[PDB]
Design a protein around this nucleic acid. Structure first.
Ligand SMILES: Nc1ncnc2c1ncn2[C@@H]1O[C@H](COP(=O)(O)OP(=O)(O)OP(=O)(O)O)[C@@H](O)[C@H]1O
Ligand SMILES: [Mg+2]
Ligand SMILES: [Zn+2]
Length: 619
DNA sequence: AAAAAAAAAAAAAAAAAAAAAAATTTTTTTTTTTTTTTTTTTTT
DNA sequence: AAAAAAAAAAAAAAAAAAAAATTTTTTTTTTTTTTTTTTTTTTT
């Protein structure tokens, strides 16, 4: 019921405390379901099955069945939340009385609060009220331990001053010891205390929602005991919490308006491997067109460059790493370099790889890089803790670093990427950190040739500004020429304009994550083995290719290329999800490796090799 | 050989950690001085 | 034999003495960061 006094004082009175606690118990037990299920029974069943420590309830259901509580909720949320903690504790103990050891506490979260305010507009009129809001996490410190029921050693006599509850507002302070009667220098008993997880995030208004002439505004937020690490930086998150002012934040200091900071005790944060995967992946792997389906599922937002779609497929699935003895580093990573004249989807390719492949990061030879190739240690600014920011490769240790504009990286990045793909370990020796972080990168890269146009007369090495050892070890070199042509340009223009009209704001092969599950399955679980290839055929293949390449200015095919051939064979076997490499796979790996080698070779020699080796490129 | 560009050095400014600096009378006890009362010893 | 002086013991009151007692804030220091100058190094 209602009276002249305020809502908060009302709900503070004991009579209505029992009233609303009874009402919460009542609808917890009785609000069966939309369609007669008693959903609270099943929710509590799962809650205690995992020991989640936290229930969540829908505000629409709350208000619809019992509306007085819903109206009271934003007015004096703290008191209602405490009582619902107690009532939920009662009902969960009723369902499972064995729960008593489990945390002695249940939190309750409220979802779908109808009235969302915007971080631009949170005024005095929302203090001490439960609001709903949206934003992006700009920072999120680590999980810290907070006092929740603290016991103090009176260090005059070592009496254990009993467990004081710790509100978020002001630090608890014992008056005196019940034994020796001193307000002594008390100090926390580290053990008998039962702490509580504390994490501090900072959300800000999303640029997609910020207005024209503006700076997005940022509100702090505190996560406690179950929601810590429920959201990482850059996550678009809805936040529901008690917008809050009265803790100790106030500019009572000199030189300041009497102006208060604010926080949000977050009461609900909402962001915005498997089984049967073997079944689906193997069932489609039966099809045996799966190689071309993968080749046509890789990079659908690009036209042409089928050679590079295939090549990046082989780079994505990789080979296998081996070490005969503890003496020979032979690698499973297939490194790729697109070299292309401008405006030919190099960065488009790279961003597709970043989107699709797990443990992918992006980096640029220029200084605009999100993540850097070098490794450095400093005090990271948004956290101000002294990190070892290990570079881009190490951060992409398993999967892919993607080096866009590979042809302009500063000489330090040249040194670092060379030493990465050569050693496969990045050797840091800056402050006192003389270590070697292993970097099993699978580098993809893009490079614009000299003069902004590919020059078929000169060779690849001398018309791209990447020095010989760097250009060598890349398992695939691909050339991208923007050759003017009627039908090609017609097709490209029609595709682009179709995308544009489709992407007007009025209109608002295998799927990509299907391919991603395929990627991890065939990258870790499946290791095709090789005793089933015409060893003599490939040995004579190297013989014939190098024998033709014997000439001046004709740096020949070598063992680098023959091991790259085996890597590509394994990769195609992986791609076929087989457990044994087959002559078909060996033929395809031969085809792609030889295509890469001839197109590396300049025009006249390219035509000689193409004419005399068309039998393999025929397949 | 001199000009342009880049890298490193020098110097000022800021943020946090941890060691220093400052404030700071009132109530209870209990010994000592004084008085008082009952008794015994001595004198009229 | 009665009166009285003295003795010891008991009590009240005033002066002196006894005892009790962590917390908050400020400042130096260290350490990085940033700007701008100077220096050095690469180019035509
Ligand atoms: N084959 C293609 N299919 C689709 N879009 C393409 C293709 N070739 C070029 N484009 C378009 O060209 C534009 C430039 O693409 P991209 O970012 O890859 O440039 P680039 O050639 O790598 O240039 P740069 O050297 O400046 O990085 C993008 O709009 C991309 O869509
Ligand atoms: Mg590009
Ligand atoms: Zn004590």
């Amino acid at each position: 019921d209602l009276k002249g006094h305020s809502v908060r004082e009302w709900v503070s009175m004991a009579g209505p405390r029992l009233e609303i606690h009874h009402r919460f118990k009542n609808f917890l037990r009785t609000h069966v379901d939309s369609h007669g299920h008693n959903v609270f029974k099943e929710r509590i069943s799962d809650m205690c099955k995992e020991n989640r420590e936290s229930l969540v309830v829908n505000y629409e259901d709350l208000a619809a069945r019992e509306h007085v509580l819903a109206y009271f909720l934003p007015e004096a949320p703290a008191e209602l939340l405490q009582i619902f903690d107690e009532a939920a504790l009662e009902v969960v103990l009723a369902m499972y009385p064995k729960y008593d050891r489990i945390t002695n506490h249940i939190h309750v979260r409220i979802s779908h609060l109808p009235l969302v305010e915007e971080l631009r507009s949170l005024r005095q009129l929302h203090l001490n009220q439960l609001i709903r809001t949206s934003g992006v996490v700009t920072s999120c410190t680590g999980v810290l331990p907070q006092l929740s029921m603290v016991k103090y050693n009176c260090n005059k006599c070592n009496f254990v001053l009993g467990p004081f509850c710790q509100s978020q507002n002001q630090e608890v302070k014992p008056g005196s010891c019940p034994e020796c009667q001193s307000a002594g220098p008390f100090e926390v008993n580290m053990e008998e205390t039962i702490y509580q997880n504390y994490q501090r995030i900072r959300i800000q208004e999303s640029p997609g929602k910020v207005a024209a002439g503006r700076l997005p505004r940022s509100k702090d937020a505190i996560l406690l005991a179950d929601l810590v690490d429920s959201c990482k930086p850059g996550d678009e998150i809805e936040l529901t919490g008690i917008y809050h002012n009265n803790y100790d934040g106030s500019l009572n200091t000199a030189n300041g308006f009497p102006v208060f900071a604010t926080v949000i005790l977050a009461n609900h944060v909402a962001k915005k491997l498997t089984d049967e995967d073997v079944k689906m992946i193997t069932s489609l792997s039966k099809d045996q067109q799966i190689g071309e389906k993968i080749f046509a599922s890789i990079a659908p937002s690009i036209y042409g460059h089928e050679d590079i779609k295939r090549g990046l497929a082989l780079a994505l699935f990789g080979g296998e790493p081996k070490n005969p003895g503890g003496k020979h580093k032979v690698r499973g990573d297939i490194n790729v370099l697109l070299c292309g004249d401008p405006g030919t989807a190099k960065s488009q390719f790279l961003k597709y790889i970043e989107k699709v492949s797990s443990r992918a990061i992006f980096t640029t030879g220029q200084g605009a890089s999100a993540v850097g190739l070098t490794a450095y240690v400093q005090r990271h600014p948004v956290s101000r803790e002294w990190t070892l920011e290990a570079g881009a490769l190490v951060l992409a240790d398993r999967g892919v670093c993607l080096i866009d504009e590979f042809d302009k990286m500063n000489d330090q990045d040249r040194t670092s990427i060379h030493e990465a793909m050569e050693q496969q370990s990045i050797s840091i020796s800056k402050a006192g950190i003389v270590t070697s972080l292993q970097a099993r990168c699978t580098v993809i890269a893009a490079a614009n040739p000299i003069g902004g146009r590919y020059d078929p007369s000169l060779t690849f090495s001398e018309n791209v500004d990447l020095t010989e050892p760097i250009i060598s070890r890349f398992d695939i070199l691909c050339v991208v020429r923007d050759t003017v042509d009627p039908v090609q340009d017609e097709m490209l223009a029609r595709f682009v304009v179709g995308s544009h009209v489709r992407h007007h704001p009025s209109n608002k092969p295998l799927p990509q994550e299907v391919l991603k599950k395929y990627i991890i399955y065939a990258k870790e679980r499946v290791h095709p083995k090789l005793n089933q290839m015409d060893q003599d055929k490939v040995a004579k293949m190297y013989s014939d290719l190098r024998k033709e390449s014997m000439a001046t200015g004709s740096i020949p095919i070598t063992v680098r290329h023959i091991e790259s051939m085996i890597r590509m064979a394994e990769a195609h076997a992986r791609i076929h999800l087989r457990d044994y490499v087959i002559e078909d796979d060996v033929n395809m790996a031969i085809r792609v490796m030889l295509e890469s080698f001839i197109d590396t070779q300049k025009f006249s020699v390219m035509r000689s090799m193409r004419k005399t080796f068309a039998r393999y490129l025929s397949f």
